[PDB]
């Protein structure tokens, strides 16, 4: 509606019998391949990402927001749990670190 791409803002400019809108849009580029899974199975319970996707780079699993590559360690802060890990299809296995354990306060 306001230009091709994810819309950020627009500036108007007068013309003799109409208007000229200068739409400013954000467009992604330089994409890359990754392997992913819908959930992680740890301790018999399934973990899902709060926001983003589980992205694997060949050997390690990470969480990353969907629209821009910024990998993070999978922790209890960015995932939520739901039931045992046998109903979801394509679940994979990996360690879900809890930041409270290493501190051991």
């Amino acid at each position: 509606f306001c230009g091709k791409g994810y819309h950020l803002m627009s500036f108007p400019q007068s013309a003799p019998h109409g208007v000229v809108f200068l739409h400013v849009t954000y467009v992604p580029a330089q994409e890359k391949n990754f392997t992913t899974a819908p959930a992680i199975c740890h301790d018999g319970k399934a973990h899902f990402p709060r926001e983003g996707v589980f992205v694997s780079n060949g050997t390690h699993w990470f969480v990353t927001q969907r629209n821009f590559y910024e990998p993070q360690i999978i922790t209890t802060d960015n995932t939520f749990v739901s039931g045992n890990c046998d109903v979801v299809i394509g679940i994979v296995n990996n360690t879900v670190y809890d930041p409270l354990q290493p501190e051991l306060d």
């Binding site: 091709k4 580029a29 994409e31 992913t36």
Partner: protein
């Protein structure tokens, strides 16, 4: 006729169907991304999970009912053609 004509259309039916097939293939394999720039492929179950979050239902609801959801979608698409043909 007596001076009238019916000039033919620039896009033939075949080319319009080709455009439509292009849009369907794009939406099935890449979701929204192909409309905002470079088409990025994403598995169809995860794309539907994205959309479920979009309407405010957590995505685990989709992963636990994938079979049921697919069956309901197939039945609806099957009844569409019969409905269009029987409706006068």
């Amino acid at each position: 006729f007596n001076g009238l004509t019916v000039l033919p259309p620039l896009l033939t039916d075949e080319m319009i169907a080709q455009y439509t097939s292009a849009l369907l293939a794009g939406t099935i394999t890449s979701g929204w991304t192909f409309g905002a720039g470079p088409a990025l492929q994403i598995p169809f179950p995860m794309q539907m999970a994205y959309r479920f979050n979009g309407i405010g239902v957590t995505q685990n609801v989709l992963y636990e009912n994938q079979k049921l959801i697919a069956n309901q979608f197939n039945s609806a698409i099957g009844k569409i053609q019969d409905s269009l043909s029987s409706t006068p």
